[PDB]
Amino acid sequence: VTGIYVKYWIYVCAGMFIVVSFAGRLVVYKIVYMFLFLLCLTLFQVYYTLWRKLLRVFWWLVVAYTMLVLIAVSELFSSILIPGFFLLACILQLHYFHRPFMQLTDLELDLAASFSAVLTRIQVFVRRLLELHVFKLVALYTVWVALKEVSVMNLLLVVLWAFALPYPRFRPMASCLSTVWTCIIIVCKMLYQLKIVNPNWFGVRKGYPNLGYIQNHLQILLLLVFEAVVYRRQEHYRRQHGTRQRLDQDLLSCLKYFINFFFYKFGLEICFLMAVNVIGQRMNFMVILHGCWLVAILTRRRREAIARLWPNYCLFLTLFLLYQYLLCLGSTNLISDFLLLLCASQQWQVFSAERTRGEPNPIPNFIHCRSYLDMLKVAVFRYLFWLVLVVVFVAGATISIFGLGYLLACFYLLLFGTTLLQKDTRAQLVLWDCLILYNVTVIISKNMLSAGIIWDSICFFFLLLQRRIFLSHYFLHVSADLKATALQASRGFALYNAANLKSINFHRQIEEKSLAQLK
User: Fold this and answer.
1) 3 state SS of 377
2) Which listed site, 87, 402, 448, 463, has its alpha carbon 20 to 30 Å from 215?
3) What value, to the nearest 5°, has the Cα angle with vertex 294 and ends 397 and 323?
4) Which stretches are Extracellular in the membrane topology?
5) Residue burial 124-163, b: 16+ Cβ < 10 Å; e: rest
């Protein structure tokens, strides 16, 4: 208990600074003290050496605050309980928790196993997803900036995020510099709430309540500081304390080999899917140019020429995003377009990972006999190639103002699916590319009207999934079934002939016995 009472210092101080607002109007009394304290904590964290080594600055800030507030000054019973207890909690830390909470941060009934293992593994996955939470901080930053209320030059901070997203030379330096620029933006935000207003690059919204007009920037710089705290805890956990082949034992190892590499050879597919959702949601000629370049970057075949266009993909993203935000300035569609740029940035990052029969060999074993692969592995590998025609048909249901062509297409496919696997993969991929092209025509065609987007997008999604299947040497042994089932049919026909001959000569003898009985 003494560790929990001697370590919980910085978060409780930030809680005092967060609940220490609204003791008067916009002055140096309540809010500006907490703003300067959060800015001092930001300078201590981003100065890369005062993460826990500015106890002189902490004690001197407590000393200056208590000295000015105690030698300077129903309404006089909570402010002395606010800042009086602020100085009292600073001195109570100086007597209890300024030595222990700052010295330990140096650099020199069986739920307990699930609790500790989940804590350590959630910390590890939270670091690997704290790169992704720098991305999610960009996400919530824009989703509060351009989707709820415009912050203090929100275009500038979201633009810092915007060129921070695709570039790894920016990311470690520009992450801390973005925390510093968001802290300076919060300083300029709380310095803009003055009372001399005398009542397009400022947007002074005249913040009334003096608490709500900072939380979209205070929580933003605080999320960047939570990322900085995760980086510091990453350094601390580094100083202290599935395989691509071992997935074939159970479904949890499949989930481990999935979660480690969920975007690895899946990425550009989900990129195109998010592009499809963006084109569906945006409804603009900007989305028409977006879909023109997206379908053009689909129009070449492999994962190699498009891999050369993928730095050019990041190039048109960086050419598009800032101009789009400033042109809307002087949307939520732009927020999900930034999410699309985030997925494309992730792909542009991890494309060239050259660090790292065969697995095709246990697969004809793995079409009937597995621990738990086959129940899902060939339900994927066989019982989706028909289900795609079901979702083609329901896309032709809802609304088919012209969807009859893909009804006739799934008619041809529904007749020809037994033998289209029996084609070789060249013509298979030819006809699949033809089919996905004739799909992605119609979405941009339904963008040229100035509903029914989701079923076409889901059809497209399953089409990318089967394209991954139809390349794969994992699928070749499911395809090897079809040569056998094409060959052995006449033997089964002769088996039905022999079985019904057995039935007829089973019934003739019964009738002979009954006629003998009657005679």
Assistant:
1) helix
2) 87
3) 120
4) 25, 149-151, 283-284, 399-402
5) eeebeebbbbbbbbbbebbbbbbeeebbbbbbbbbebbbe
